[PDB]
Amino acid sequence: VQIVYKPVDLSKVTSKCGSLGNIHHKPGGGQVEVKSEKLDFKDRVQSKIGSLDNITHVPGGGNKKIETHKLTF
Amino acid sequence: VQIVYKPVDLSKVTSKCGSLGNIHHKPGGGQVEVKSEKLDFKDRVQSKIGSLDNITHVPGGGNKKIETHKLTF
Amino acid sequence: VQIVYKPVDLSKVTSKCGSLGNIHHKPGGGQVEVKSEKLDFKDRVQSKIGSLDNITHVPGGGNKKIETHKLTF
Amino acid sequence: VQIVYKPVDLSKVTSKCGSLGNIHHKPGGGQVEVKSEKLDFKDRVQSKIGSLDNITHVPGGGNKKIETHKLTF
Amino acid sequence: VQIVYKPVDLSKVTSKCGSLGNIHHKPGGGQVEVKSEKLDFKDRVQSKIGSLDNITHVPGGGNKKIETHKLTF
Amino acid sequence: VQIVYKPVDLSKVTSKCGSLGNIHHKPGGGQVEVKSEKLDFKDRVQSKIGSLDNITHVPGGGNKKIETHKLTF
Amino acid sequence: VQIVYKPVDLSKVTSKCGSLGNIHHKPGGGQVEVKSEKLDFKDRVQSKIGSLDNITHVPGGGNKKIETHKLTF
Amino acid sequence: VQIVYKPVDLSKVTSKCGSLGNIHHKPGGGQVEVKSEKLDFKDRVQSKIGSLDNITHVPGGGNKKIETHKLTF
Amino acid sequence: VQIVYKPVDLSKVTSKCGSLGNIHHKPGGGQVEVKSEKLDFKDRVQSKIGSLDNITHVPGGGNKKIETHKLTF
Amino acid sequence: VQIVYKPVDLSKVTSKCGSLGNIHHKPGGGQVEVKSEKLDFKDRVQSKIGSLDNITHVPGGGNKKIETHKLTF
């Protein structure tokens, strides 16, 4: 049994931008309420209860490259 | 048995942009309410209960490349 | 048994844009309410209960490339 | 048994745009209500209950390319 | 059994940006309240209860590259 | 006397090709026989005498652009 | 006398190729025989006498751009 | 007399190639025989007499750009 | 007399290649026989007599840029 | 007389290559026989007589840039 794994990657993910500009994030404040009582969490539990998130994300390029290789035998 | 795996990738994902411009995110605030009582979560549970999300995402290119390779035997 | 896997990819996903311009996201605030009582979640459960999402997404190109390879034997 | 897999891809997915222009997303706020009681979810359940989504998505090209390869034996 | 794993990667993820510009994050303050009583958490539990997050994230390029290799036998 | 020589060239010479295939150059061998006595070559003489050439030229595009610009007085 | 020589060149000579394949150059061998007595070469004489050439030239693009710019008085 | 020589060159000569493959240069051997008596070479004489060449040239792009700029009085 | 020689060059000569493969240079051996009596070479004579060359040239890009700039009075 | 010689060069000669592979240079051996009596070489004579060369040249890019700048009176 001979297995040869030799992929070749010369790719690119790119961007160019002159300027981004004026970005205004100004939401009115809101109200979030949760009236639960019992929260018993177990065994791989990911939980967000009752939240207010104000997020401004402005990268000067937010390019992503995800690459996965796998050889099993 | 001879297996040769040699894919070749010279591709590109790209963008160019002169400017983005003036971006205004100004939603009226809202109200979110949850009146649940028992939240027993277990064994691979992903949960978001009761939330208000104000998100501005303005990348100067948000290009993505996802590549997966897999050889089993 | 001889298996040769050698695909070739010289492709591109691209965009060009002069400017994006003035983008106004200004929804009236709304109201979201959930009156449930028991939420027992288990074994690979993905759940969003009671939410208000205000999202502005304005990438200067949001091009995507997804590529999957698989050889089994 | 000889198997040769060598597809060739020199394709492109592209766009050009002078400007996008003025985009106004201004829906009146609405009301969403759910009066359920028992939500027992299990074993690969994807669920969205009671939501209000205000989404503005304006990419400067949102071109996509999806490519899948598969060789079984 | 001979296994040769020699992938080659000469790729790049990059961005260029003239300036980002004036970014204004000025949300109205909101209110978040949780009225739960029992939070017994165990065995791999990730939890955020009752929060207000004001985040401004403005990298001068926030490009990411994630690469995974795996050979099993 | 005002001349102003300003030609503008924004041209392209291009090609795309999936595959160049199988090229087999297998001519039978031949014979070249040349008899002479006196070779008197003077003043910018260029010559090839008695020769045998087997040439395989297989470029992945052999595009050419040739230009001459001449201005005199 | 004002001349102003300012040609502008923004041209491209390009190619793309997936694969250059299988090139087989296998000519039979031949014979070259040259008989002479006197070779009198003077003043910029260039010559090739009695020769055998087997040439394989297989570039991954052999694109050329040649230009001449000449101004005289 | 004002000349002003200012040509502008923003050109590109480029290529992309996935793979250059399998190149087999296997000519049969040959014979070159040259007979002469007197070789009298004078004043810028360039010559090649009696030769056998086997050349394999396989560049990963053999792109060339050649230019000449000449101004005289 | 004012000359002003200011050519501007922002050009590129480039290439990309995944793999240069398998190059086999295996010519049969040959024979070169040269007979002469008198070789009288004078004044800038360049010569090659009686030779056999086997050359394999396989660069990972053999791109060239050649330029000449000449100004005279 | 004012000359002002100021050419500007911002050019690039470049290459990228994943792999240069397997290069096999295995020519059969040959023979070179040269007979002469008198070699009279004078005044800038350059010569190669009776030679056999086996050359393998495999650079990871063999890019060249050559330029000449000459100004005279």
Most B CBs within 10 A among D8, D35, D54, hence the mutation to make, goes to D54
Cβ of E20 within 8 Å of Cβ of B60? The answer is: yes
Shortest alpha-carbon distance between residue A24 and chain I (Å): 39
Alpha-carbon separation of residue E35 from A33, A47, D35, E50, J22 (angstroms): 8, 16, 20, 9, 70
Distance of CA D46 to the CA centre of its chain: 15
Tokens read off for C9: 């990819």
Amino acid identity for residue G51 in this structure? S
- J with C: touching (≥3 Cβ pairs within 8 Å): no
Chain F residues with CB-CB distance to D10 below 8 A: 16-18
Among candidates C33, B30, C24, which has minimal Cα distance to A52? Answer: B30
Cβ of G60 within 8 Å of Cβ of H61? The answer is: yes
C-alpha H73/C-alpha D17 separation (Å) is 50
Cβ of B10 within 8 Å of Cβ of H19? The answer is: no
C-alpha C49/C-alpha A53 separation (Å) is 16
- B with F: touching (≥3 Cβ pairs within 8 Å): no
User: Given a contact as 3+ CB pairs under 8 Å, which chains touch H?
Assistant: B, C, F, G, I, J
Cβ of D5 within 8 Å of Cβ of C7? The answer is: yes
C-alpha F25/C-alpha B13 separation (Å) is 39
Q: Three-state SS for B17?
A: strand
User: Given a contact as 3+ CB pairs under 8 Å, which chains touch E?
Assistant: A, B, J
β-strand pairing of E2-5 with B2-5: unpaired
Total domain count, chain D: 1
Contact C4, D5 (CB under 8 A): yes
A16: nearest CA in chain C?
C60
Tokens read off for I67: 């330029």
**DSSP character string of chain J:** -B--B--EE--EEEEEEEE--EEEE-PPP-EEEEE-SEEEEESS-EEEEEEEEEEEE--S---EEEEEEEE--
Cβ of A49 within 8 Å of Cβ of E53? The answer is: no
What are the residues facing G23 on neighbouring strands?
F23, H23
- I with D: touching (≥3 Cβ pairs within 8 Å): no
DSSP secondary structure letter of residue C35: -
C-alpha A13/C-alpha A62 separation (Å) is 10
Please report the beta strands in chain A, taking only residues with DSSP state E, as ranges in sequence order.
2-5, 8-9, 12-17, 23-25, 31-34, 41-42, 45-57, 64-68
Most C CBs within 10 A among D34, D37, D43, hence the mutation to make, goes to D34
Cβ of C24 within 8 Å of Cβ of D19? The answer is: no
Shortest alpha-carbon distance between residue J12 and chain E (Å): 18
Among candidates G69, G27, E40, which has minimal Cα distance to F5? Answer: G69
Shortest alpha-carbon distance between residue G47 and chain F (Å): 5
CB neighbours (10 Å) of residue D68? Answer: 10
C-alpha B35/C-alpha B54 separation (Å) is 22
H19: nearest CA in chain C?
C8
Q: Find tokens 């794993």 and name the residue.
A: E5
C-alpha A65/C-alpha B67 separation (Å) is 8
Among candidates A46, J2, G9, which has minimal Cα distance to H9? Answer: G9
- E with J: touching (≥3 Cβ pairs within 8 Å): yes
Which residues, including other chains, have CB under 8 Å from residue I48's CB and lie 6 or more apart? H47, H48, H49, H51, J47, J48, J49, J51
Whether C28 and chain A come into contact, CB under 8 Å, resolves to no
G32: nearest CA in chain I?
I32
User: Given a contact as 3+ CB pairs under 8 Å, which chains touch D?
Assistant: B, C, F, G
Contact H18, G17 (CB under 8 A): yes
C-alpha H13/C-alpha H61 separation (Å) is 10
J16: nearest CA in chain E?
E10
Sheet holding E31-34, edge to edge: D31-34, C31-34, B31-34, A31-34, E31-34
Q: Is D71 left (phi over 0), alpha (psi -120 to 50) or beta?
A: beta
Provide the residue range defining the domain that includes B9: 1-73
Cβ of G42 within 8 Å of Cβ of F42? The answer is: yes
Cβ of F54 within 8 Å of Cβ of H28? The answer is: no
C29: nearest CA in chain D?
D29
DSSP secondary structure letter of residue G28: P
